[PDB]
Amino acid sequence: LDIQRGATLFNRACAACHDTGGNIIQPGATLFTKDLERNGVDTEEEIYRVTYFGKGRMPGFGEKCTPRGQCTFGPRLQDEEIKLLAEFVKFQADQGWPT
């Protein structure tokens, strides 16, 4: 809901890999609606879950993400931050990642 706060957090925690909604590591697994839909995760609740726990080559960010090697070696994000990020991603995907 707070777009500017979500954008700021996204820019520092996510953008290097998901530049403008993309995926610089894994083609086909972007944050665009088409890929989110194909991968079964075009919802806020699914975006939150994958951000929290990770999946293959993406680290999880949740406080209770486990085991250690599947999660960020940087600081974990709080639930509220991951919720803001999931809402931001869903909103941006719905809008087509405006530039």
Closest distance of CB 99 from ligand HEC, Å: 18
Binding-site residue numbers for heme are 26-30
For position 3 contacting ligand HEC by CB under 6 A, the verdict is no
Nearest Cα residue to 10 out of 65, 78, 71, 84: 84
For position 84 contacting ligand HEC by CB under 6 A, the verdict is no
Q: What separation, in Å, do the N-terminal and C-terminal C-alpha atoms of the chain show?
A: 19
Q: Residue from 51, 65, 84, 92 that binds ligand HEC (CB under 6 A)?
A: 51
For position 36 contacting ligand HEC by CB under 6 A, the verdict is yes
Distance CA 66, CA 71 (A): 7
